[model samples]
Target: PRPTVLVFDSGVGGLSVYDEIRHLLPDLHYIYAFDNVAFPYGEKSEAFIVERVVAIVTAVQERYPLALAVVACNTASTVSLPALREKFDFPVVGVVPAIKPAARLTANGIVGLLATRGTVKRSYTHELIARFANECQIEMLGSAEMVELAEAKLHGEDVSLDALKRILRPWLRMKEPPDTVVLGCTHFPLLQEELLQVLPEGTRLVDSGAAIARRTAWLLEHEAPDAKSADANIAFCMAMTPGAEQLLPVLQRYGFETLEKLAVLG
Candidate 1:
């Protein structure tokens, strides 16, 4: 049997990470779970996010056995990783801010972290700062609204550069502005062009997409060698709601054009 991986997120944001994973490990079976009923996890409490995530994950794992589980939502990763690990027997992967790499690569010793409110407030994020940014200056910006705007763009809304400029103006005005900006949320990386237009010429933008892809590949290789089987195919399931149809085009834009739905996990 080929190794299968299940990736979960609130909306279409996880497509960014999924695209990178497919590029790095083309043979692995990928299952995407879009929990449209509980969209915008940033505004929800950690406990609430954890409960919903665990439920959806349990259902996914039952419907389709997976070698690894990848949580692509920053808010869900921050709030629920521990509980998820404890609940599932399979290896679980999550996207967290790439602070360690960002710290080492920052030229100006200043780094900016853009993420959802839940992720920014999590102890995991603070621990990352403590571990890697002892000498560097780190600024954390939290925004549920920004995540919505990014989702809107995925929905085919032609987001204007002016909106990005306004949202990023505060960071731009800082003394010795961040040389490297961490797209702390998976959704934020989708706004790459807008971010490029908002920042300076040499400002570096980084995200965990590549790292997450590498990790997924590593897990598949070690845990399931047959993960590279040619017959392996991609599948998708939506939880508790119907957003897959509307979100299909957005996902297609990021290389996830095909999907199916699972109303319940059990």
Candidate 2:
């Protein structure tokens, strides 16, 4: 079997993380899976997130061997990366909200968790805040609408100034909001430009995407030590909803031309 890596996302948002990994490690085949049926894991139970992930990874394991896997969705990553590691033999990596990273950038001990409602609500996030930014005042602004706006931006749409202003109004009203805001969702980096429009001038964004890309690249070297020269790498996209065909045009642009339904069983 060829070397393969699974790029798992709760929804299409993980595609941003996938793009980072794909560009860094073009030597391996990719199996990018999404739980579209259970898309947007933030509002769901933690148990539900674990269930969808295991079954999808199990199907991938039985069908094709894996070198590494990354939980590209922050929600899924925090909720179930351990479940997949216990259930499988390969190394799995995930993106965190960067609570640890951004904690260091705060001025006057003010940091923020700017993420999807689902992402910021998870206990894992607060735990990180308490652990790393204990001395800092870490505020949380979870956005259900921003996730939709990010998805829309990928579809050739622009974010509404009013839509964004309404959300960041509280932060704007603040004489100075947290200087460092972690873009906790993979979908976030996609809106960096528009976010700049709403966020305070000095507010900077942090994400774990580059870390995931660098780490995934490191793991592949051992899983496929040869780093054999291959023609352009191929990516296979799967979804429990398999309803991602609507994203076909954009998916193709992202180096993934095929989007198929993932079978729960072989």
Candidate 3:
């Protein structure tokens, strides 16, 4: 049997992570990606997020006995990963902002944390800060509006530089502008260039997309019984067909062009 990797997200944002994962580990055959219902999960409540994750996992597993599962959205990873891991048999991996790396990389002792309202407010995010950002002044920017703006830009919507500036102005005026900007949500990575226009020079942006990909490879090698196979596969599923259509081009922005939907799973 070919090795299979399962990747799930509330929306197309996770494509940022999936793109890197595919690049870094090309041998993997099946990458089951889902962007079904409740996309753009940044606005949803914790309970609803968890429920959707369970549904996606259950739906994915029935078709492919995955060697590993990657929760590519920070919101879903924060709200649902623990419970889902306990209930499922595959090794579940998650995307966490590269905070530890940010702390290590910061030269000004200030770090900007950019994310959705749900992820920024999660206890998991706080704990990550506490653990790695103890020496740095971490600035948290929580805004679902910014996330939506990112979605629009990724989907080729006409977004103005003025609109980008408006969203990022607050972060630009800090006493000591952050030397490192932590991408707390996967979606935020899509706005890197626009954010750079508003931030000072030499400010670094960090996210766990690549790191998560490496972890996915490591977990599969260490724990997945199917790792010995010569072929690996990647499969994709989505909740909202219309939304997925709207977002496919954006996902292709990160080099993930083709996406499939599973109606039977729905």
Candidate 4:
């Protein structure tokens, strides 16, 4: 049997990362786990977020023998990865804001980082900017609202373009507007079209999805060399909620074979 790879997030935001990985490695079995009961990690305290992620991921690890695990939420990845790596035996991959790439992509020496408030404030984010984006002026915009907007958009709801534009207005109105925008939160990619509509004509958008996909493939190649390809089957597991029932058809549309609630084991 092919080894299962787990993609975890606070909510559906990670589906963007899951989709990228699925496209890159179609043969790998996937299990997407989310803590919808505590949906928005952005608003939660770091200590609380870390504890929740560790608890849920531990629950997932107990249920599935995973080859690798992807911490697909920026907020969770920024705060939880080290603890998770310490606790889990398998390789753990994390999603980070594409500051380096955005720095490189910017011609105007200004870059925009769109992320959840939690990610923007993390020391990890500042460290990344200092290390790789010193030459460029970086503008950071954090919005808890965008996360919710992206989630609704993914679930087949019609999102308001005006609302999206309002969220992006501050960055757009800057004295030296960024020529490159980094989609720092995984959820932001789901709003690609809406983002493009609001951004300047020449502005470039960068996200870690493709890079994460490549990294996952590389890790699997080395760590699971003997792993066999299997017909892709994805299990979408959420923390107990009636929301999953509403989300089932949408998940099925995305090729998720199973939709079930998974209780986090203490």
Best by TM-score: 4
Worst 10 residues of 1 by lDDT: 224-233
Which numbered prediction scores highest in lDDT against the true structure? 4
The estimated TM-scores of all candidates read 0.90, 0.89, 0.88, 0.93
What does candidate 1's lDDT look like per residue over 1-266, in tens digits? 45777778888788888888889876666777877766778778777888889988887766676688889988888678989889887778988898889999998898999987777888888998989889898988887777878888877777777777787788878777899989888889888888888887788999999899999878776764232223335445554234456666665655554766665532
Candidate order by lDDT, highest to lowest?
4, 1, 2, 3
lDDT per residue for candidate 4 within 35-108, as digits (tens), equals 77877888888899888888887777666677888999998897788898898777889988999988888899
**Regarding TM-score, does 2 or 3 come out ahead?**
2
For all candidates in order, the CA lDDT equals 0.78, 0.76, 0.75, 0.83
Residue pairs that clash (backbone atoms under 3 angstroms), model 2 = 42-118
What would the per-residue lDDT of candidate 2 be over residues 48-132, giving only the tens digit for each residue? 7788788888886665667777888888886787788798778888778888878777776778777898777677877887898
The full ranking of all candidates by TM-score, starting with the best, is 4, 1, 2, 3
lDDT of 4: 0.83
Angstrom error of the Cα, residue 259, model 4: value is 0.7
Model 3 segments beyond 4 Å from truth?
Answer: 227-237, 249-258, 263-266
- Superposed model 1: Cα runs more than 4 Å off: 224-243, 253-257
Worst 10 residues of 4 by lDDT: 224-233
lDDT of 1 at 31: 78
